[model samples]
Target: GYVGIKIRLTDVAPQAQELFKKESLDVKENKVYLVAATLRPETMYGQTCCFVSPKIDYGVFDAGNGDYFITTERAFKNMSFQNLTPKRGYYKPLFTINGKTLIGSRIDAPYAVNKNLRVLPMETVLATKGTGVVTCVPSDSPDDFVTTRDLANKPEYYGIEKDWVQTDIVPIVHTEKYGDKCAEFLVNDLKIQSPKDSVQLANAKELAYKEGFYNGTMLIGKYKGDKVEDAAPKVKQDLIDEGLAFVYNEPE
Candidate 1:
């Protein structure tokens, strides 16, 4: 069981998209891909990596003729709640594949300053959270920073490139307590080993969300330098309009 949602990374390098388009043989239309979801989309500018649960099972489903692969039955049901038409009943459970099978899979992370980040595994992503897909933004996210550090330091544990987690996390925004370099400081101070540290995770999420919303400013996009609070709505809308993304409401 996993939450499934996709992040739109429009800020990636053109080369990355070219590489993905070239390497991705599984591309399909109107299919939902089960991806781990996260709360921090703006920090996408700092994405140096991404995480998937290697032990979990995933699937590629048809959504309005486009192919989207997702991880959980709940997420698929949620997609139906969002008005996406699943092939059978509420959600058509399609082919299942393991996370390890997805390694070396190339994806287009639209807003990242660096477009070359690869899809990897992080065992801590919860299947209940927003889509269960967690994109790594080490600069602004403490969990991401700590997780990336772990992957880099202990590659044998995670089974991926050590450098993938060590990729540079550029400071795209500033916050109150975390500052522009919060992730770096927290990584060193907390010596965080995993994303399961509840207190720290909550604190980091709160800090990142507040700083990114109130004080942080965008450095890219048509809304470059605009406050994240202002830009987030617009970015989300743009994704919806382009049919690249959509709004899915979770039940209260």
Candidate 2:
């Protein structure tokens, strides 16, 4: 989406650069964001963290305006075609680095209570997906809910600091069918203890999406108490207005 949400990378960007210093990459003095994709912008208020696949490769591109964006080369190519860059179908990557180097890095999650969100590993992040970057909205997404729980419960196993997953999952929307914590409520009710429960998680996602849009009420942000359908567009537009979000189209 919009490279506007400027996730200030404290160390990962520089660290990645230093690691690849031998590659003779062009380093710029600007902020570089790993522009994440999230369909539920309304649910961003609850974002706990962001994820990347440990083995996937990511490129840092100069997105102009004293800013850069880190994503797979494939995504940068797509963005180039979408007019997000200076050239059409061409982008000069500052450098490339393995995704695992970004683990433990910190970022700012726009509109979320945890403004400081941690970067963690999610083995399933496909290099072909939107930016290969995923925002975590544990309150409304079953996969996110299970993933956070696993990380929190076995931080060592995930090779992360326990405090990273300790960021409380903020309640953003309240639905008649699933209450405030839709994902948590459903995961509990369905006995979904692991993120590996893909089938059941898919069911939970479908239910959450339908009920969240049709029957959900905003519990936070400027549209508190407003119906989700009524509040969603307003929230999204606000993000666009303030340069916090831009459209990220999916390839068919």
Candidate 3:
């Protein structure tokens, strides 16, 4: 099961905000969420931003209790049957928009070191996966590290401002072999230059997951100094109990 983190909206690009208001989307009064799916809930503290694919279309749905969720239509349908939505087998979106419309939006990631993180684009986001949304944890994720660097270097090409791309990476876990920032180390070690380097990134991600879970220790958050394997479940439960995130299972 993967965790679906409820990343709250803090702000949005001027044009996007205007469109939201015109569409009667009460982002100010009713809480808006961008739910991202992750297998490593313990590493969420290092999240810097949420990623959405510009090529995919996303929907805003009523998540009950005056809250809204922005995710892929197919994902929400699964959630509805899983009892995560307002009604079982009734997953209907309030409105629909392209993921491109969400770029540059500011959001609050649970337990994140960086505040008011911005929504960015990741070309490799899989629409058929857990969810179209993905949280960026550059310190632990090789894909994030490389994608972040790409966005920072060519902001104009991505149609996002340079400042929106966070360059100051934070260290979350310390591993003997990879040190604190394992993602950066592995990315460079494998010579993975672009985010589109799926082959290398997959290997790097696998290496990071194994090393961090077995040999790494939490450098930040409440589980500091504890092994990731020992502390991961605790952090995941904490997030679930606090309503910051929920368990989301993928269909077999």
Candidate 4:
């Protein structure tokens, strides 16, 4: 029912492109690419930050291009067989890095409103989860929006400063049930407190998603005023056509 976009994380934005040139092997060719996968290309317009699991062991590895990739050893193996890595059947990591180091790092997420978005932690991301990297769209996601708020609320416990998590959650789509900001509306109306409201969120997601996805209109993007059902696939194609994203199909 969904397709993923394979971002060339080694690829940097225009501003940072001049800073990190492919240089002296290993010494100056700083490993920096962190490929992120996302199913919602249309929501790219509202991205505010990126998330990674804080406890996993990740690696920065050569990507055959003038770039590097950050991911788990297991993920690398899978990708190698899936036609992602250069060798197609094997790989050796360039350098190992803790997921912790990724925090507060700035990244370029194509189509995002902000050119520079911060890296943050999401402790719940399964080490085996898709890409192990998720770009935050607080506007549409009840989980991302609420987690950002709580990470700020209890900064000491979460290990990030209050201001670091302060992103003005934007609106991505319009729905008759929740208007322009479905996540905000559902998070409040459900009287749900923080990310711990798992059972509550299940219910919230059920309603919020049904209305916004199965029925609604796009908002706050070039696709604004478009129907959600119709715009979803076109938006995905646009990302691929523009080279902003590559097709990443997972087998059944």
Best by TM-score: 3
lDDT per residue, candidate 1, 131-158, as tens digits? 5567777777777777777777778776
Clashing pairs in 4: none
- Candidate 2's residue-wise lDDT over 131-203, tens digit each? 8888888889988888888888889988888877754767899988889989889999999977878899999
Candidate with better TM-score, 2 vs 3: 3
- Residues 201-228, candidate 4: write the lDDT tens digits: 7788777778887787988677789888
Q: Residue 135 in candidate 4 has what lDDT?
A: 72
Model 4 TM-score relative to the real fold: 0.82
> Candidate 4, 32: how far from true, in Å?
3.7
The TM-scores, one per candidate, come to: 0.79, 0.90, 0.97, 0.82
RMSD of 1: 5.5
TM-score of 3: 0.97
Q: Weakest 10 consecutive residues, lDDT, candidate 2? A: 1-10
Cα-based RMSD of the predictions, in order?
5.5, 2.7, 1.1, 4.5
Q: In candidate 1, which residue ranges exceed 4 Å CA deviation?
A: 1-25, 28-36, 189-193
lDDT values of the candidates?
A: 0.61, 0.78, 0.90, 0.69
Q: Which is the winner by lDDT between candidate 1 and candidate 3? A: 3
Q: Which ten residues in a row have the lowest lDDT in candidate 1?
A: 8-17
Where is model 2 more than 4 Å wrong at Cα?
A: 1-6, 13-17, 20-29
Q: TM-score: which is higher, 1 or 2?
A: 2
Candidate 3 Cα deviation (angstroms), residue 247: 0.4
